[PDB]
Amino acid sequence: MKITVRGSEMVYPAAETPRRRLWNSGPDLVVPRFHTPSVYFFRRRDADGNDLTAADGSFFDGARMRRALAEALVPFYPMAGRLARDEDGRVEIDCNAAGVLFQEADAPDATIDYFGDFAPTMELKRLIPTVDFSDDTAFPLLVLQVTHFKCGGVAIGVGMQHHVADGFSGLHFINSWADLCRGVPIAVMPFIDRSLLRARDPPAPVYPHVEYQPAPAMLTPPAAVAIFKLSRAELGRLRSQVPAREREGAPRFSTYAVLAAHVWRCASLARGLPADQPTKLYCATDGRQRLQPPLPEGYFGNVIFTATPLANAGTVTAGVAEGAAVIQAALDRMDDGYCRSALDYLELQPDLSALVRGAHTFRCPNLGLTSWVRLPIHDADFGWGRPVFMGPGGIAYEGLAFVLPSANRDGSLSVAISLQAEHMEKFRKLIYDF
């Protein structure tokens, strides 16, 4: 598919910004190392057919966007910084307003519909500017690219470095970028200081934090990527396979626990894991309302703690009910005490870059399932309308999956996932087999 770079320029903050070092919390430092690939799609028209082009005839005007960008780079000023170690080796952010990369591009021969279901395939990744990772102190924390398409359609490819923000804060920035570009003031100001997620003095962890321990191994084959939608009705059915035990007294399983158990099960069956094979499911968890007192809105960075349900495949593949209980218990266990204890625990390891989650974390027999269901991924209205889709621009690792809210409020959920190719073939036949 032919794509040309119309042009690229480093954008800089639209005012004075402190040239400080930013302390990175433990969570900021264990999330995966590179950039979070995100991709938006907008159509020139719809939903009825209405033209979305502005009065002034603009549709995603580069200059107007670089302008908002620069402005939003002021409160969110560390988005402009660079990665620096410290007097120890501990990665922190160097706020040096060295700017973010922005860049326009053209897809003259192809409509957006070329991407079909928008699976985070290899092809989709090209909508994002490529970074050179070989000098992590050099590359910008935020690369951007707005691609204009053969039928008036537009694609924003976002590449945000993990240390900087999680889905919540990252989307805070992007949505704020789109707010300015639309002529609206930022509703909530980023809190830049990540002091609130500092360990206790001295560290007193009360758990061994299974989430930071080495994933289970089997007692490299390239990976296929696909996306699977489950309607509100299918989700209902799946849920009904989970008998809400009256005699127990406990609350019903969350929808996540049910969907995740189903995915964990399909993945385990797809991979042909024998019954005694242990398997670990990684579930990124938002600590914003786990911690007490709650973090202040606008808190800027990662508040991601990790729930890792762990069981034998036999338990997981025996049914959704049994997997969901394991998952739901793992989740319920993430309270203020557990989260704060995880802070203390990370403060004790020597090199945190050994705890960074990567390919070793998520690959067979294990799994990651990251939910964006609660994230405002469809809020980015720059002035020309809400996107028709947003999701991961690629999936770096075999075994990693994402849950995505429906773009059109229809109550469906989509699962985007990378598996070994032979496993994916099976998985396609399993994921709806219920």
Ligand X SMILES: O=C(/C=C/c1ccc(O)cc1)O[C@@H]1CC(C(=O)O)=C[C@@H](O)[C@@H]1O
Ligand Y SMILES: CC(C)(COP(=O)(O)OP(=O)(O)OC[C@H]1O[C@@H](n2cnc3c(N)ncnc32)[C@H](O)[C@@H]1OP(=O)(O)O)[C@@H](O)C(=O)NCCC(=O)NCCS
- Work out what residue 331 binds among ligand Y, ligand X, none; the CB cut-off runs from 5 to 8 Å by kind: ligand Y
Of 368, 393, 394, 405, which one interacts with ligand X (CB under 6 A)? 368
| Site membership for ligand X, residue 161 (CB under 6 A) | no
Q: Does 412 bind ligand Y (CB under 6 A)?
A: no
Would you give the binding string for ligand X spanning residues 173-202, x where CB under 6 A is met?
-x----------------------------
Partner whose binding site includes residue 32, from ligand Y, ligand X, none (CB under 5 to 8 Å by kind): ligand X
Binding partner at 260 among ligand Y, ligand X, none, C-beta below 5 to 8 Å by kind: none
315 binds, among ligand Y, ligand X, none (CB under 5 to 8 A by kind): none
Q: From the list ligand X, ligand Y, none, pick the one residue 400 interacts with, judged by a Cβ distance below 5 to 8 Å according to partner type.
A: ligand X
Q: Indicate whether 281 belongs to the interface with ligand X (CB under 6 A).
A: no
Give the active site residue among 35, 162, 262, 423. 162
The binder of ligand X chosen from 11, 119, 154, 304 (CB under 6 A): 304
| 170 touches ligand X by CB under 6 A | yes
Considering the complex, what minimum distance in angstroms separates the CB of residue 159 from ligand X? 9
Pick out residues in 232-261 that bind ligand Y (CB under 6 A): 254-256
Site string for ligand Y, 148-177 (x = CB under 6 A): ------------------xx----------
- Among residues 61 and 166, whose Cβ is nearest to ligand Y? 166
Please state the three-class secondary structure of the chain as a single string: CCCEEEEEEEECCCCCCCCCEECCCCHHHCCCCCEEEEEEEECCECCCCCECCCCCCCCCCHHHHHHHHHHHCCCCHHHHCEEECCCCCCCEEECCCCCEEEEEEEECCCCHHHHCCCCCCCHHHHHCCCCCCCCCCCCCCEEEEEEEECCCCEEEEEEEECCCCCHHHHHHHHHHHHHHCCCCCCCCCCECCCCCCCCCCCCCCCCCCHHHCCCCCCCCCCEEEEEEEECHHHHHHHHHCCCCCCCCCCCCCCHHHHHHHHHHHHHHHHCCCCCCCEEEEEEEEEHHHCCCCCCCCCECCCCEEEECCEEEHHHHHHCHHHHHHHHHHHHHCCCHHHHHHHHHHHCCCCCHHHCCCCHHHHCCCCEEEEECCCCCCCCCCCCCCCCCEEEECCCCCCCEEEEEECCCCCCCEEEEEEEEHHHHHHHHHHCCCC
Q: Mark whether 162 is an active-site residue.
A: yes
Q: Is 255 annotated as a binding residue?
A: yes
Asked if 109 is an active-site residue, the reply is no
> Closer CB to ligand Y, residue 59 or residue 338?
338
Residues that bind ligand X (CB under 6 A): 31-32, 36, 38, 158, 160, 165-167, 170-171, 174, 282, 284, 304, 357, 368, 370, 400
- Enzyme catalytic residues: 162, 381
Q: Which residues are annotated as a binding site?
A: 167, 255, 286, 290
Residues that bind ligand Y (CB under 6 A): 166-167, 254-256, 283-286, 304, 331, 370-371, 373-375
